[PDB]
Amino acid sequence: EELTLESLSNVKANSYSEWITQPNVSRTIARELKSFLLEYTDETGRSVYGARIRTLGEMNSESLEVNYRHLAESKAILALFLAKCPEEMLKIFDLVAMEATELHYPDYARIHSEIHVRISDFPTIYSLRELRESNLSSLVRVTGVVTRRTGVFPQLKYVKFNCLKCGSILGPFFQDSNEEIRISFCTNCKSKGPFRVNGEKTVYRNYQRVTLQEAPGTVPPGRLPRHREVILLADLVDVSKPGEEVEVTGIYKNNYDGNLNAKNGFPVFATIIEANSIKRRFSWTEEEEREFRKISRDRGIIDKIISSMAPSIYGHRDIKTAVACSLFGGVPKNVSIRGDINVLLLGDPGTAKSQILKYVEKTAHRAVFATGQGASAVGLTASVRKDEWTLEGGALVLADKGVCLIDEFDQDRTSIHEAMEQQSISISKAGIVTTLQARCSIIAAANPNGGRYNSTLPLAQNVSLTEPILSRFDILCVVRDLVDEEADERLATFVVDSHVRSHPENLQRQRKKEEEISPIPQELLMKYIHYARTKIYPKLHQMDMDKVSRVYADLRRESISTPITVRHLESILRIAESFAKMRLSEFVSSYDLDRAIKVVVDSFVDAQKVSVRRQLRRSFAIYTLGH
């Protein structure tokens, strides 16, 4: 006999699981679950789970998305039961998924013999510290940043064995993913013995563990962050990468180990979470695609973007232009033409250069921020440690088409050398020669010669970077703490206004808060860069490139007059492409090239201030400013 859902309400069992394991109870639970899946629908009346099954089959995904609220909306009794005893109802609901999927996709078992239920929107949430033994053996929704990840190694999903004494075959016991089997007995002969695993009958599931550490902000001030390990199983394996904030939902399991016992001298059990559903806490959409396409216009769209670059920072319009061009970047032409735009941001200390770099960090879809002193050249490149024996990558490698914010300019220097020469990182650590293609943009900043900039002596003399390093930068930027009462007053007004607007006292008010300091909304802009880089691929204008050729020849003549390189030409081309991209132009126009010419000519002018600056100004007044 089967029971009613109201009958299920009467647990009438020693434990919630004890109630669930009841056979008729299991039947009722399965029937109700299938009823929910087929019946529960969005307010629209469409079976959200029906469409989910459709996609699941279509994508061949082996994990079925599930929203906790949906069951809480209907059959909430089962929601509570699952919360109390997640494992049992997870198994039952997985079988329900078997049945729901097969009816719509008969014989889907071929594609995936099994499926995995993925609960979502679990109401209760706890931090690692919040976790308590009461929480154990129940589902928990937790958040953090993954500290370390291990490679996805196979694990024995199902296991048969063979008693050495007789042991023809032993049952295909299901491995729990947390402990060994240790049957410690033989059915063929009633006794213990070496139970050799039966390679004939065994199922293997992808296995993985990643350590999770409490988010810094989540940590109470002064309190020490804590971390727990969460085992990732097949499908869920390799979802996120170390150093990434993530939220997960799994059973807070535990187990015994004499290791900790002796370590703490007490009978205490290690606690681990078996992730049932992972979630990482930007991407544009069709609405944003079409919106960008409209707003993409000749109406100072470049100028508007620049105005929205580091809006919290006053002036520095040239710097804003350079950083915008770096963000959008330029199309690479491999054979090996670099497409990245490496920009250095030399300035007097306290000139907000670090702040604009951080802005880019927030404004960058992918970027790596490091400190020349607080960042390791090994951490920039790679390192090797026992996993066992394994290597790890470096920050520069971690930058993959993503701007590499850096400043505070040894081993780091040569690492950059190899990086700038070719966007890849060679390494022979542990006698294993290999390379790591970074292929990423770079942003640099520093204090000239560790002191106030000196107009006298060229920009290179104002710094200590080797000339190769200087040249391989797509462009260089100089900032000087010159004093002007009018400019100082404007800066003071801007700063005080910034403090006032930012003061906590001052959500819907955000629209007035932005104060139109940025012509375009920041989010729309971020999606703008992402969409443009993904889709916009400027095409150079050969007919215009002839004028580019003669212009570069003129620049070479003037360099001989008092030092240009083909690298300068390539930088001009790259930044022209970036100009085209900022306005969603897949065809580079003469105006892109004009802006590129002006910018690169300025970056050349920064050389030799007191020496030649005036002469260069007179020579190039038409090339850079004339139009």
Binding site: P225, G243, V495
Partner: protein, 613 residues
């Protein structure tokens, strides 16, 4: 079984002390049976532990029960718990059960509190083993809470006979003989995790206090153990008193899971390690919510010095009462302690509101006493000498404990509070750079050692250095008069440079002041306010959130222009304007005004101008 008639007598006396205590100060001597009332509250909230004052049980039954329990707490604990269950049945039978499926037995933790005395770590003696005592000290280390297996349950893997309610020793214990007489399984005890009940547990390490046995000795340390609600009950690195019993920890490895006792173990010996099992933990080290926390008289006093308008000057005077002179420097203390409004702009850029002060004085300027008062009077305050200090110990350290892990440094030890840095001049340049990046980021990231963790590291820094050559050459410039990386100079909010003066009158005054400081010792000093009063007012001000004013916006912009002109910029930058705004915030907090006042900006402008010298 063993009668332990004394044990059951203690059980009876204990239940009668829990139910018939019949004592309550509320409504004067009117008796409420405060333990029966605590049982009622227990039913209200359905907790596990029962808080029991030692003094209450002491006055109970002449304290003979207190004496007996305090000695043989270990022996009496099962009897006490059984009596507590009996009392629960008598009055809270619902709580008797854990309280849907069957609800198991509810464990009650008898956490005695308010002991007669606290014995120091070195006061610990084997004689006290198992006796209920209380220990004070700061928490040097702690552990993640983990589920100790209180009551164990095993299914007999040969007949399926299930065992339950098996108390575990230090080593993981298992059933020896199957309860089913028909079965004869002596092993193969698959632990029934579900049936078994696990209590929360946490190891905690503490060290001896400075004024405990400082005489020629290294501060002794103890490993106390938190259990039940006590777990996590206390924060790390804080002086607290832990009441509990002295527990002897045998080495499980010897148990099997100088020499030791044997011939039991059997042939194996056994070596022990004393420890402590805490039962109760007590720490001893919003604006309206803060007022609520205050007492009525405390609130009145708060209002009293709030009404005072000289309050600002009197507070500055109270600062470093022992220290004489250097009133602007004391003002700097007060302002830094008050801090400033930290804010993250709409773009998200975090704007620090904290103030990091620097001091450059010749030797004997009492800057040492200055920092001593600061840290002593400042919560979340860490003091260190730059000459002798390690970066990791100052910011954060990586250690391996079963396994790579992290150890907080000074910045962590005082994040979100004072960070005193003595002998800064002597401090390592690379370590100075580590701090520079850390403080500027208001963040510390442990990228090395494989791990890439990061911590808030937000705090205020009171740098204390001496001028190069032990004397500040006024001909030279601050940048150059002292060895320190200029960019870190940029982000030091203040620079109190202390010079010597041959003013005979001042010399006489200071000499008399010091000689009185020795003659009358404590009587010599007399600050306007008590340090506790000062802290209460300071926290109240912290509750305030200064807001900038139109007149204040103006006054600020002209004053910054004037400063730029004055340097006309080696020491004047946008950082200086930021510090100006922060100083305005601090002044308003001292004024306890939610808004900024051009007078406040004038004060800050004078402060920075003097700092420029």
């Amino acid at each position: 079984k063993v009668d332990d008639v004394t044990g059951e007598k203690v059980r009876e006396a204990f239940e009668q002390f829990l139910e018939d205590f019949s004592v309550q100060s509320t409504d004067t001597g009117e008796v409420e049976k405060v333990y029966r009332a605590q049982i009622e509250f227990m039913k209200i909230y359905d907790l596990n532990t029962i808080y029991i004052d030692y003094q209450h049980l002491s006055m109970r039954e002449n304290g003979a029960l207190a004496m007996a329990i305090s000695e043989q707490y270990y022996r009496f604990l099962p009897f006490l718990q059984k009596g507590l269950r009996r009392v629960v049945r008598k009055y809270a039978p619902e709580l008797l059960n854990t309280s849907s499926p069957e609800q198991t037995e509810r464990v009650f933790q008898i956490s005695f509190f308010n002991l007669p005395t606290v014995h120091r770590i070195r006061d610990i003696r084997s004689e006290k083993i198992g006796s209920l005592l209380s220990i004070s000290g700061t928490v040097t280390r702690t552990s993640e809470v983990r589920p100790e297996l209180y009551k164990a349950s095993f299914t007999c893997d040969m007949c399926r006979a299930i065992v339950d309610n098996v108390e575990q020793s230090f080593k993981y214990t298992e059933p020896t003989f199957c309860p089913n007489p028909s079965c004869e399984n002596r092993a193969f005890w698959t632990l029934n995790v579900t049936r078994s009940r696990f209590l929360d547990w946490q190891k905690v390490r503490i060290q001896e206090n400075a004024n405990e046995i400082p005489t020629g000795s290294m501060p002794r340390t103890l490993d106390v153990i938190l259990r039940g609600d006590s777990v996590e009950r206390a924060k790390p690195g804080d002086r607290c008193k832990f009441t509990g019993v002295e527990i002897v920890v045998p080495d499980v490895t010897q148990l099997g899971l100088n020499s030791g006792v044997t011939g039991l173990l059997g042939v194996r010996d056994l070596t022990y390690k004393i420890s402590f099992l805490a039962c109760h933990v007590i720490s001893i080290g919003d604006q309206e919510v803060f007022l609520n926390s205050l007492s009525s008289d405390e609130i009145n006093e708060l209002k009293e010095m709030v009404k005072d308008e000289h309050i600002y000057d009197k507070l500055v005077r109270s600062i470093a009462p022992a220290v004489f002179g250097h009133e602007a420097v004391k003002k700097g203390i007060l302002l830094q302690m008050l801090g400033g409004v930290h804010k993250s702009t709409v773009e998200g850029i975090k704007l620090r509101g904290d103030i990091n002060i620097c001091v450059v004085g010749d030797p004997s300027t009492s800057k040492s006493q200055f920092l001593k008062y600061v840290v002593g009077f400042a919560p979340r305050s860490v003091y260190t000498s730059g000459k002798a200090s390690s970066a990791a110990g100052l910011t954060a350290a990586v250690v391996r404990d079963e396994d790579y892990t992290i150890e907080a440094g000074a910045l962590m030890l005082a994040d979100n509070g004072i960070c005193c840095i003595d002998e800064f001049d002597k401090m390592d340049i690379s370590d100075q750079v580590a701090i520079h990046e850390a403080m500027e980021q208001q963040t510390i990231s442990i990228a090395k050692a494989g791990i890439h963790a990061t911590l808030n590291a937000r705090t205020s820094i009171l740098a204390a250095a001496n001028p190069v050559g032990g004397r500040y050459n006024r001909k030279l410039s601050l940048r150059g008069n002292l060895n320190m990386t200029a960019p870190i100079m940029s982000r030091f909010d203040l620079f109190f440079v202390i010079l010597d003066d041959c003013n005979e009158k001042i010399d006489t005054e200071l000499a008399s002041h010091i000689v009185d400081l020795h003659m009358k010792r404590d009587e010599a000093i007399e600050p306007p306010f008590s340090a506790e009063q000062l802290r209460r007012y300071i926290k109240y001000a912290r509750t305030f959130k200064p807001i900038l004013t139109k007149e204040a916006r103006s006054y600020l912009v002209e004053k910054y222009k004037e400063l730029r002109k004055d340097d006309a910029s080696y020491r004047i930058t946008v950082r200086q304007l930021e510090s100006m705004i922060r100083l305005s915030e601090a002044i308003a907090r001292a004024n306890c005004v939610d808004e900024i006042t051009p007078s406040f900006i004038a004060e800050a402008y004078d402060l920075l101008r003097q700092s420029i010298i």
